[PDB]
Amino acid sequence: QQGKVYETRTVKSKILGMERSYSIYLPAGYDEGDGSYPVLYLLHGLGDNHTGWVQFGQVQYIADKAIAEGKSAPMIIVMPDADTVHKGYFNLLDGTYNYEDFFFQELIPHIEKTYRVRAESRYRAISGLSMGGGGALFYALHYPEMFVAVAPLSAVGGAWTFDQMKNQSDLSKVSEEKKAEVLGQMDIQTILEKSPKEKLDRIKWIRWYISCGDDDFLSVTNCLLHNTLLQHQVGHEFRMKDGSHSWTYWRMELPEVMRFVSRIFTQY
Amino acid sequence: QQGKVYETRTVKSKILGMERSYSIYLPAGYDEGDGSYPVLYLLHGLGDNHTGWVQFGQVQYIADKAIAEGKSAPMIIVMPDADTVHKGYFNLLDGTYNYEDFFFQELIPHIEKTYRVRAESRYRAISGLSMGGGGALFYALHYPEMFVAVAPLSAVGGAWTFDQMKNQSDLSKVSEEKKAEVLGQMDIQTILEKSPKEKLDRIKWIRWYISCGDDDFLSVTNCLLHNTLLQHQVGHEFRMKDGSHSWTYWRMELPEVMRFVSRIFTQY
Amino acid sequence: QQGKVYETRTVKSKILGMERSYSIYLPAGYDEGDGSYPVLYLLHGLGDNHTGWVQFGQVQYIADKAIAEGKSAPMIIVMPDADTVHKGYFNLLDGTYNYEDFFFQELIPHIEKTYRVRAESRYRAISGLSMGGGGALFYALHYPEMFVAVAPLSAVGGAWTFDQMKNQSDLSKVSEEKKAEVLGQMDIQTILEKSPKEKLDRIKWIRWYISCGDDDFLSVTNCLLHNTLLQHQVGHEFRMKDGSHSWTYWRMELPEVMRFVSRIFTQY
Amino acid sequence: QQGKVYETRTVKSKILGMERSYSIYLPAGYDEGDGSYPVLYLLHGLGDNHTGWVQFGQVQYIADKAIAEGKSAPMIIVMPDADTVHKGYFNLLDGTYNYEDFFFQELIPHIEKTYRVRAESRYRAISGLSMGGGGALFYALHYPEMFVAVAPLSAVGGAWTFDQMKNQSDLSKVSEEKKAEVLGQMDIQTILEKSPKEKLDRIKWIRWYISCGDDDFLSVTNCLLHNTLLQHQVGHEFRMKDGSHSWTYWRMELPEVMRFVSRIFTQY
Amino acid sequence: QQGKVYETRTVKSKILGMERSYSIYLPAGYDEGDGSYPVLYLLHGLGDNHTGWVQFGQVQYIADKAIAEGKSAPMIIVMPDADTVHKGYFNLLDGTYNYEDFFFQELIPHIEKTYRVRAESRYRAISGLSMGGGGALFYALHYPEMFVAVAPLSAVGGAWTFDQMKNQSDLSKVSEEKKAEVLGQMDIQTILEKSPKEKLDRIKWIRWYISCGDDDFLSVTNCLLHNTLLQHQVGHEFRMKDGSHSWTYWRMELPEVMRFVSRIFTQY
Amino acid sequence: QQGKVYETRTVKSKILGMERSYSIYLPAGYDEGDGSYPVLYLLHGLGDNHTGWVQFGQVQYIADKAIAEGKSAPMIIVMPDADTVHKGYFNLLDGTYNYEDFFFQELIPHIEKTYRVRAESRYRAISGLSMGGGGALFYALHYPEMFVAVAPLSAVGGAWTFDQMKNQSDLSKVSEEKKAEVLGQMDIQTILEKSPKEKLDRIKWIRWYISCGDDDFLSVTNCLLHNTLLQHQVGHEFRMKDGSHSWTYWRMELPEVMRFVSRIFTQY
Amino acid sequence: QQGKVYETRTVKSKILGMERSYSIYLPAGYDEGDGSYPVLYLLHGLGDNHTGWVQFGQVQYIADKAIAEGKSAPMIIVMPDADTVHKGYFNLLDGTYNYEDFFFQELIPHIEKTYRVRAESRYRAISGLSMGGGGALFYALHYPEMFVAVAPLSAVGGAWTFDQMKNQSDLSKVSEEKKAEVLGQMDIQTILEKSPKEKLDRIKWIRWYISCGDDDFLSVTNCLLHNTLLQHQVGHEFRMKDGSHSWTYWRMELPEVMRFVSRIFTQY
Numbered sequence A, B, C, D, E, F, G: 001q002q003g004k005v006y007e008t009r010t011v012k013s014k015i016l017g018m019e020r021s022y023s024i025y026l027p028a029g030y031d032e033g034d035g036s037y038p039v040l041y042l043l044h045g046l047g048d049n050h051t052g053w054v055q056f057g058q059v060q061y062i063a064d065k066a067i068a069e070g071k072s073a074p075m076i077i078v079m080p081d082a083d084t085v086h087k088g089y090f091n092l093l094d095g096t097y098n099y100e101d102f103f104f105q106e107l108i109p110h111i112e113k114t115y116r117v118r119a120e121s122r123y124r125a126i127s128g129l130s131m132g133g134g135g136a137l138f139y140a141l142h143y144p145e146m147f148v149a150v151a152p153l154s155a156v157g158g159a160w161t162f163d164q165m166k167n168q169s170d171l172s173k174v175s176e177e178k179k180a181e182v183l184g185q186m187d188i189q190t191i192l193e194k195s196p197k198e199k200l201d202r203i204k205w206i207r208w209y210i211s212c213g214d215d216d217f218l219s220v221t222n223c224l225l226h227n228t229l230l231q232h233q234v235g236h237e238f239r240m241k242d243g244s245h246s247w248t249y250w251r252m253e254l255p256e257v258m259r260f261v262s263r264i265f266t267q268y
């Protein structure tokens, strides 16, 4: 019936030189039997940390119910802290805070070693809201081989994300050639047009679920994303539902994201 | 519990020089008491006529159910024939077929004369699919004083509508200046930028519900419409749901349109 | 299961020198058998007429449902037109428009002659919203012998009502002595303190149901009314519920009003 | 809501030189409004007549329920008598009984003249059981332009049908060259291989629903039919469900046939 | 009430010279009381292993629900790994990998020794999908004394299975006479024609449940199988349902298989 | 959803020299369409007449519900008066009151002429309670060609029935040979042993449903009947349920009788 | 809430000189609190042992459900093994196997000492099927002081049981007279005619529930038993329901037996 949440566990990060927090939801029956589970990485927005999806997202109640009713197969849900020290998901421009490196090289392997996780891309999905929606989006565009399904909710765009990366970096140490390089790596149109074919094929292979409310200040950004993806022949699910930039919207979408990635995990 | 549909009645049109067909749904209990009802005009797509919303849209079953369940207040639904002689909702460029004039100067007054109708704009809404979605959209942008609520479904755009008008007109008799004027009258950007303030204010006052499936070949057109409307401060409901350019989508949306306009008719 | 509404019938009023509109709801099965029914008079607000409770209040659907479910006993509901010529329920100060006289001396006797009505005060109730809530309130304070139950919803007070009467009157024909007399007749404090015992006893005998939303601009007025009635030992039901000055509130309260007066009509 | 059945009406047949019986189901509300309906022709098996689908098939109860529940859109159901004089659906070899000619040249036009029928192939379907399943199958292969959807239930094959045509004919008048001609016209393999592309395209365009119980003595025949159709690239729905050659099976399949053809009539 | 799954246990195989994986479902309450259970052996398709029916088949959720609802009696479900080293269920022709020997001589005795199993054929069933459907089919035809119930889902035929056996064998070491011997043992018609009466009676005694979707590329194979079994007087349940070669089909069929074999386990 | 009952109609009997009463239930929708219905003859017990199954049996409510719910197909139910003048179903020994002759030669033809009845034995059933259970039983044993289904409820035996016939006859005119002849005609053992093969075969073909409460004083009689029928290879349904000789029992069994005969009427 | 079953426990029998098997169902919540429970002894048929009611009867699921739903009060269910060494419930005629002595002198006291059992006859019931129905019947006729309620299901008679005893006894050592004496002890008529008043009163005091399917080859035996009991004024519940000599019948009757004996255990 009931899964459980741990909020206080940390990962020893060599890349960030500190203990990094995360929250984790383990499904009901994790403690019986010996099997392993697929994983959904679930990213918070600006101003929250790893407790955001727990306290505001109510992940425990919502995941318990979805799994118990059969709307979702059992899965582990990992909620990283991208708030402490610096807020955001990507490597800072001054080289002092390689958060994206930490996520892929330390957090994911730590989860797969510490919990009974099916450690394959076909069993790995990522979702997030606002800042975390852009995090999910560009994580998958940068490393499409690492995910089978991606669900950006009310996602911020690349220009906002890049602007936030600059405002947290010491730009005295950043060359102008470097600013231009990342700028392109944080631009959807550039990634889709200039990536090698192998990378583009994998991006098309990913199952995308993009959802944003019609009253959200990001509704135009996400409509432009829909159009850009179709222009580049990246099939995806797109939803514009009634709602705003609010936790009412994100709690409504969480069981939909769970059903979406679960069907991909189990096949159909 | 059951309304009824008349498919075979006609209006004598002086503007078009002929009897013109329409279908009409009368709600349950229209035949008892003496009261009047608000009206939803419901427009078909290319290749269908006034029987399209009856046979494919299943308006009778769907409207009966929504009203009986209290999801919609009772209303009359009028489905014009915009297929016979020429296909489309607008005045042809050669002056020989003024369908939009017919709709406003003859069809609406005929309905209000023949049936127990609340003959005010606050009780008049319009909706349609595909070609009829473009019909509903531009009818309201042309005559916003005539409608309180507008629901374009999977709507075609102005350029397609204008091109389809051209292929039905005698262009040997059409001046080059005439093409340029009507092109602007069928372009949303031009209407929103060049209309007098009284018309723009009324366009902003109208309650808009714009819905299109994410797999529709028109999904990009309707995302651009959402963006243009917000760019001009025209608030509206926007929905992009799962679905394609199909009667599954349009039958799904019909009770949503009925709930939407009913709430405006009854106030809330 | 379904009652019916007539909107187009009139009373020939000698007092107002014209045919006066009303709407009337007749319960299901009024047309079978020969029996008679109690009556709820249901008053509209400023700017609406006798169609307001029909189109916005959805009286037919709401009354049909309440009676069919047994939440209310069958009753006739009469909705007068207090909008045409002058807006409001009371005699104008210049003597040219004695609407209150019309209501009691012409409308009520016309209803009781024309329909199968139990024509006794124990079977007569009155309710209304906003301007009509003040109408119901002061109709009952003026003629407490005529009603068994009174339900002012989101009601305006006496000072607002009197100001309205003045702005529609030719005050060149009004003495200041008359202004003083009518203002006192439109002040609840004055009525309760200067009424004879027989009249005050009848006011206390009436069953009052006073309801107003907490977000309504009239919430303070109605809280003050609650305190004044208790201060004068006039027992009553008082409700302050979530809601505003809206048809959502008044449609929510209509079946509560029907249940309230029905229990009084049937005894319990 | 209840439709109704007429069992005693006839069509004057010049081709057969007699009054010919049929039963017809008219949907609920056929008597209200003026609209027209699509038609399902529903054929009986050997030994029954036009009353078989009424009394054993319980068409009235089953169709009423399917339509009232929204599982099927409203439709007219016509059940011909192919039992009186000679049993079977096809022209006898001695030229004395051209039943197939009667069905297409007299029965269908009579129905479309007498009832409010949408008289187009897109609104015409045919289904039947046992002998009538072979009837539906070969009517559609002979005249594929006449049907949009075909549903043979527990259908006999061509060899059985042709053998019965032989046993009902006076072969003293039949040449051997004619027997070979009809034999090919009643063989699915010959029709699919020898039809011109225009006819074959229409056969492939038809929506087929072929269903047979796994305990039916005809299960092998219908499995071979499935294999033959796929080998000629005729897409179709095939169902082999638990059950035998019984009215339990056919009453179970009737609402499935209704939903199947209804979806085609309304589009989706 | 939740059962549990162990995925990581193994049986030490002398025949295969290695530890061999399997997954096992134990029903709710296996850990209370001391009783024993019947067993369903459940085989995966090509490219999956013992985790396929766990992760994609969702065996734990589906079995929990079927048993808790009383659709199935409690049973143990064993999912062998027929993927590691070599893919497939049968003894390779070069003598290097006797998987079928392993299954009957080592896996089944290990299960009956290790778990509380009713170790009799009346309590032993086998089912599988695709490659595993052919495995279940020919396992029972080779050793019909070992099973009371057999359920091939979307099963490959003997020619496909034998061809896969050749492609995994070192054919440089295989005699042409041996190639002929195995081929006859992997062809359904030969077994039914060449088995002694004792063996054929047991094949007829087994309760067979054969199910395949009508859109599966194996639908023709399975229709031919249905016809072959009836030609040999082997009664069986045959289902051709809507569906494709997909996990939607196999998850739909799993509770049906459980109910089918459970009724045989419990008698009725 | 509503059938109706006529209690006051009569059939003019030449055989009995009087107008004879019956009650008849006509199913819902009898008055729409033109079709015909099967018939259940339903016989009362001692001391009641043709109103017994109406007032005590509540035939209208019970039949309406069974038919509306689909537990029974629509049917006509005929309830004869076998109480007026003499009580009982059989020809009196003195030749003065040939009630059985009346039932078969006058009542059945009158019903088939007067109502829209399918006038064949396959559409004719008979049931009854107590005295009428013996009536149904021996009517069918005497004339098995007239019924397809027979349902004796709490039935009296032949010895009781014969004794009642004697006590109502003037035995002064009856020979001892005549008493012996009728005794044998009213003895189930004699009927089953001595009826010709054709009669006995038809008795075995009839579908029998025999039901009696375990607390009924007739429970022994009906257990002996079950045993006698099996001894003579007359297959039948037998029910001994909790209950007594009461209208609670017969109202419980009426919808079971309707479902039993309905399945026979419609086939399955 | 689930009870549990032990299948592997044994009673140390000095009478039979060996460990004797039984199964036992303990109700949900047996492990909470310290109270005691009534007991139903539940006997298997010929060829099964103490696992029959567990595996085929599904006693755990059925008892769990009946108790959880409040259809039965909690009770312990004991299922003896009457199959090992010799099949049957009674003392063999050669004196070498006194199974009835074992049941009463060893099994019942063992159950009452080992489990929390209300060890009084008012809390002791017995039921069984086929051979075990005859076991329950004659156990109670032999020792009526030991049971408050007895439920023979599809019961064999005394002549069959006695014949079963002879075919297992060493007839070379068995005298003709002892053969006659036990024959009378296994004949219902003899027991009922020759028992003293004290014993007959207790047999009449027992609450009997006798049930058998109408298609069972033992239906005649049980109808004769019903008649014999009534002939001797032994009131009892008798049921003849649709069904055969099958586990469908016995699983259907098990919760009815539980409800029946539970009401007697709890009083009403």
Ligand SMILES: [Ca+2]
Pocket: A214, A215, A242, A243, B236, B237, B238
């Ligand atoms: Ca919105």
Ligand SMILES: [Ca+2]
Pocket: A236, A237, A238, B214, B215, B242, B243
């Ligand atoms: Ca989509």
Ligand SMILES: [Ca+2]
Pocket: C214, C215, C242, C243
């Ligand atoms: Ca509030």
Ligand SMILES: [Ca+2]
Pocket: D214, D215, D242, D243, E236, E237, E238
């Ligand atoms: Ca079958």
Ligand SMILES: [Ca+2]
Pocket: D236, D237, D238, E214, E215, E242, E243
């Ligand atoms: Ca299909």
Ligand SMILES: [Ca+2]
Pocket: F214, F215, F242, F243, G236, G237, G238
């Ligand atoms: Ca009883």
Ligand SMILES: [Ca+2]
Pocket: F236, F237, F238, G214, G215, G242, G243
């Ligand atoms: Ca039976």
